[PDB]
Amino acid sequence: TALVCDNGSGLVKAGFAGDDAPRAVFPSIVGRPRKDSYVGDEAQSKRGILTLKYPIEHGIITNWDDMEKIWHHTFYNELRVAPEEHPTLLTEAPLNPKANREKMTQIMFETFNVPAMYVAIQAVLSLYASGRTTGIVLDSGDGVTHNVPIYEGYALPHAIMRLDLAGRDLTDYLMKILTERGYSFVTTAEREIVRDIKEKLCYVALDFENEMATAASSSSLEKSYELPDGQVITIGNERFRCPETLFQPSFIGMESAGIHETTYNSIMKCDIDIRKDLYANNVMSGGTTMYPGIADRMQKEITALAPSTMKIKIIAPPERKYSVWIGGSILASLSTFQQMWITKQEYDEAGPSIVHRKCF
């Protein structure tokens, strides 16, 4: 039984290879008093008198001491396994620096004493989860958004696009525009309410101006939301104004291109002879791609940018907030993957840089 640990900026996804979903999902946080430290949910359930730190920023591990606490908590507290008895598949962001993946390997072998391990690119695993080995993935989570074009299991690094806005920014923006409406969301508990409103009632409009006009002249787009204590508030055009930022980042002051444009730019940076297969295999993954309407809007926007004869297909699997993990669960449970593991024996001979030769 190999393990699969998908470490995100906001959420850890962990479980056992061969399972259809992670056993444990919890915030990628470590907390200290404003005991010594609180990791994951016990830090979350104490979000009021501790200072929280995120060891992963924009998909990149930046605090290795707290990351070790996350990995320890994952193994012992969540999965209830001894890491010495299980090969462990880990995930990394696209373009993860060489020094980072080497220290990932070193900590797994030297600190947790895993018998074997592997590091896979997150977006590649999401493509695998949809049964594909060629395509272009839009991966949008809590801290970062990427376009990753992939040819037969290999990400094409020169064509990878990035957008430094994701779910946390959208939560903050929904907070901002709900307060401009007249509500108050200032406490940490109230921020969690805004995140829940975002995940439950927000959607992507097919056309922003048409939708704004509908919300201005009728109540047909308004939704009731019951707060935990009992009050009912009304959410109107904030429902689609918040995720509109993915297509128009200027709503939060970013002049970067929106996700339809990073997708098109990514495909255009690939060799012309694979662009046809990329256009027909656009796979959406990550929690921030869960908005209703996002596939239909991406289809409309990419169609407007691509040649008129190009077949455009957006694939948005219902499980895509766990697509990376599911792809790792598939990969690590395949018989042909057995020889791909980095073994502790291999690590002792070559050292941490073995990950460059075995994981690509």
Binding site: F16, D19, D20, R23, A129, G131, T133, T336, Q339
Partner: peptide
Amino acid sequence: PSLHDALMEAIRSSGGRERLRKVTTNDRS
């Protein structure tokens, strides 16, 4: 003729999430 070729074929014919054991998620997102 390559191990990578066989792995890619195995990914395409894996059945996806369909053939994975149904488990329960203790999801605290």
